[PDB]
Write an enzyme that holds these catalytic residues in place. Structure first.
Site, short mmCIF file in Angstrom:
data_model
loop_
_atom_site.label_atom_id
_atom_site.label_comp_id
_atom_site.label_asym_id
_atom_site.label_seq_id
_atom_site.Cartn_x
_atom_site.Cartn_y
_atom_site.Cartn_z
N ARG A 191 -6.84 -5.21 -15.64
CA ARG A 191 -6.69 -6.60 -15.20
C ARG A 191 -5.28 -6.89 -14.66
O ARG A 191 -5.07 -7.93 -14.00
CB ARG A 191 -6.97 -7.55 -16.36
CG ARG A 191 -5.81 -7.67 -17.33
CD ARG A 191 -6.23 -8.33 -18.63
NE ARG A 191 -6.16 -7.37 -19.72
CZ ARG A 191 -5.09 -7.22 -20.51
NH1 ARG A 191 -4.02 -7.98 -20.32
NH2 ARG A 191 -5.09 -6.29 -21.47
N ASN A 192 -4.33 -6.01 -14.93
CA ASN A 192 -2.94 -6.22 -14.48
C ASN A 192 -2.58 -5.39 -13.25
O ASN A 192 -1.43 -5.41 -12.82
CB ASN A 192 -1.95 -5.94 -15.62
CG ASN A 192 -2.01 -6.99 -16.70
OD1 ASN A 192 -2.21 -8.16 -16.41
ND2 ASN A 192 -1.86 -6.57 -17.95
N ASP A 212 1.63 -3.70 -21.43
CA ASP A 212 0.28 -4.19 -21.13
C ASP A 212 -0.33 -3.52 -19.89
O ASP A 212 -0.83 -4.20 -19.00
CB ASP A 212 0.31 -5.71 -20.95
CG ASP A 212 -1.06 -6.35 -21.16
OD1 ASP A 212 -2.03 -5.65 -21.51
OD2 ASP A 212 -1.15 -7.58 -20.97
N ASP A 251 1.36 -7.57 -12.76
CA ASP A 251 1.78 -8.57 -13.72
C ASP A 251 2.71 -7.97 -14.79
O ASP A 251 2.52 -6.83 -15.24
CB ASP A 251 0.55 -9.20 -14.36
CG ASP A 251 0.90 -10.18 -15.45
OD1 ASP A 251 1.18 -11.36 -15.13
OD2 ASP A 251 0.90 -9.77 -16.63
C1 LIG Z 1 -7.54 -12.05 -1.78
O1 LIG Z 1 -6.54 -11.75 -2.76
C2 LIG Z 1 -6.96 -11.68 -4.12
C3 LIG Z 1 -8.25 -11.92 -4.51
C4 LIG Z 1 -8.65 -11.84 -5.94
N1 LIG Z 1 -10.01 -12.09 -6.34
C5 LIG Z 1 -10.33 -12.25 -7.79
C6 LIG Z 1 -11.77 -11.84 -8.16
C7 LIG Z 1 -12.77 -12.51 -7.17
N2 LIG Z 1 -14.20 -12.28 -7.60
C8 LIG Z 1 -15.14 -13.14 -6.78
C9 LIG Z 1 -16.61 -12.81 -7.17
N3 LIG Z 1 -16.82 -13.00 -8.65
C10 LIG Z 1 -18.18 -12.56 -9.00
C11 LIG Z 1 -15.84 -12.23 -9.47
C12 LIG Z 1 -14.39 -12.61 -9.06
C13 LIG Z 1 -12.51 -11.84 -5.79
C14 LIG Z 1 -11.07 -12.17 -5.29
C15 LIG Z 1 -7.71 -11.52 -6.87
C16 LIG Z 1 -6.32 -11.25 -6.45
C17 LIG Z 1 -5.94 -11.33 -5.16
N4 LIG Z 1 -4.58 -11.05 -4.81
C18 LIG Z 1 -3.38 -11.14 -5.56
N5 LIG Z 1 -2.16 -10.65 -5.05
C19 LIG Z 1 -1.06 -10.72 -5.72
C20 LIG Z 1 -1.06 -11.33 -7.03
CL1 LIG Z 1 0.41 -11.43 -7.91
C21 LIG Z 1 -2.24 -11.81 -7.51
N6 LIG Z 1 -2.28 -12.41 -8.81
C22 LIG Z 1 -3.39 -13.07 -9.44
C23 LIG Z 1 -4.55 -13.62 -8.68
C24 LIG Z 1 -5.58 -14.23 -9.31
C25 LIG Z 1 -5.56 -14.35 -10.79
C26 LIG Z 1 -4.51 -13.86 -11.50
C27 LIG Z 1 -3.37 -13.18 -10.81
S1 LIG Z 1 -2.01 -12.53 -11.76
O2 LIG Z 1 -0.79 -12.30 -10.89
O3 LIG Z 1 -1.66 -13.46 -12.91
C28 LIG Z 1 -2.48 -10.94 -12.50
C29 LIG Z 1 -3.47 -11.20 -13.65
C30 LIG Z 1 -3.15 -10.03 -11.45
N7 LIG Z 1 -3.40 -11.68 -6.71
#
Ligand SMILES: COc1cc(N2CCC(N3CCN(C)CC3)CC2)ccc1Nc1ncc(Cl)c(Nc2ccccc2S(=O)(=O)C(C)C)n1
Length: 286
Positions: A152-153, A148, A169
């Site tokens: 997104r990963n 995968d 992921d």
């Molecule tokens: C500050 O750290 C983070 C911020 C975001 N976001 C997500 C989008 C968001 N925007 C805001 C404005 N919107 C308009 C759009 C969205 C900004 C911040 C996303 C991920 C991280 N960090 C992070 N580190 C290790 C893992 Cl391990 C993980 N894992 C993780 C974090 C969140 C969801 C899923 C996983 S996951 O590990 O299942 C894999 C799918 C990456 N996420």
């Protein structure tokens, strides 16, 4: 239960972090089994995957398995595992915190606009791709198949320059990611490292379109038929021929005809050296 790099390991082999040493801070979004948080350990900054207390046995095991797998990797383009908290409920997996967020968001929120006209250049994109190809390479020479490889990963350490991208992921390794898969995978269910090669090619398109959904306008089944009939996406907007050329090599129909990641890696390097490529302007979205 899990075996990798030769060694065999089990839950006994995960670093249990005492729950009292773990503070949650804010939620970041939701992964496979639940909301992921930003958090701390003692001072250490982490992401915290959590398992919902009300879940199945299989849920329990998938969750544990994700910890074993990600815990046995040792590569700088694969997210680190700080430890687990599995003896208090809800369960925790502690991972390296990636301040830049995931790659698909980053690309979308950083698309050059009239105000942010220079948010990114072609060379930022090639380093993101180098980073990931380097991770995928590490997996291939360890005979691990990811299944995968997608925007997104992937995750970024920081938003600004100096950002390092990492595979973040390992959930795979109508919910099937058809749009990232080679014919012999969604037809015969055959996987080898030549299938991560195909996926990477699609990731490269995601990267160079700046976070567009692959085969824009096509459903899963249309993509499946398009792709098995020999159909292939056009260059993302403004994408240099040599970068597109890597995409279409990754998408060769015959697994044996697709490059391995050492070869993909060489070609991302050559692209990175070519002024014609990196002096190319990204589309300023209006
Ligand atoms: C500050 O750290 C983070 C911020 C975001 N976001 C997500 C989008 C968001 N925007 C805001 C404005 N919107 C308009 C759009 C969205 C900004 C911040 C996303 C991920 C991280 N960090 C992070 N580190 C290790 C893992 Cl391990 C993980 N894992 C993780 C974090 C969140 C969801 C899923 C996983 S996951 O590990 O299942 C894999 C799918 C990456 N996420």
């Amino acid at each position: 239960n899990y075996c990798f790099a030769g060694k065999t390991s089990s839950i006994s082999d995960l670093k249990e972090v005492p729950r009292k040493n773990i503070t949650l801070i804010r939620g970041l979004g939701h992964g496979a089994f639940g909301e992921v948080y930003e958090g701390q350990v003692s001072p250490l900054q982490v992401a915290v995957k959590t398992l919902p207390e009300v879940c199945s046995e299989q849920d329990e095991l998938d969750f544990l398995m994700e910890a074993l797998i990600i815990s046995k990797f040792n590569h700088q383009n694969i997210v680190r595992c700080i430890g687990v908290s599995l003896q208090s409920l809800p369960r925790f997996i502690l991972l390296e915190l990636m301040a830049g967020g995931d790659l698909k968001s980053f690309l979308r929120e950083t698309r050059p606009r009239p105000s942010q006209p220079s948010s990114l250049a072609m060379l930022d994109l090639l380093h993101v791709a180098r980073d990931i190809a380097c991770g995928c390479q590490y997996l291939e020479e360890n005979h691990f198949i990811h299944r995968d490889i997608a925007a997104r990963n992937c995750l970024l350490t920081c938003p600004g320059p100096g950002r390092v991208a990492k595979i973040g992921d390992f959930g795979m390794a109508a919910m099937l990611p058809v749009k990232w898969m080679p014919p012999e995978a969604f037809m015969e269910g055959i996987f080898t490292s030549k299938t991560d090669t195909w996926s990477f090619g699609v990731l490269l398109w995601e990267i160079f379109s700046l976070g567009y959904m692959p085969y824009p306008s096509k459903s899963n089944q249309e993509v499946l038929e398009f792709v098995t009939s020999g159909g292939r996406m056009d260059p993302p907007k403004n994408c240099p021929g040599p970068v597109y050329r890597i995409m279409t090599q990754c998408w060769q129909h015959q697994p044996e005809d697709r490059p391995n990641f050492a070869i993909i890696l060489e070609r991302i390097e050559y692209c990175t050296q070519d002024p014609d490529v990196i002096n190319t302007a990204l589309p300023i979205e209006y």
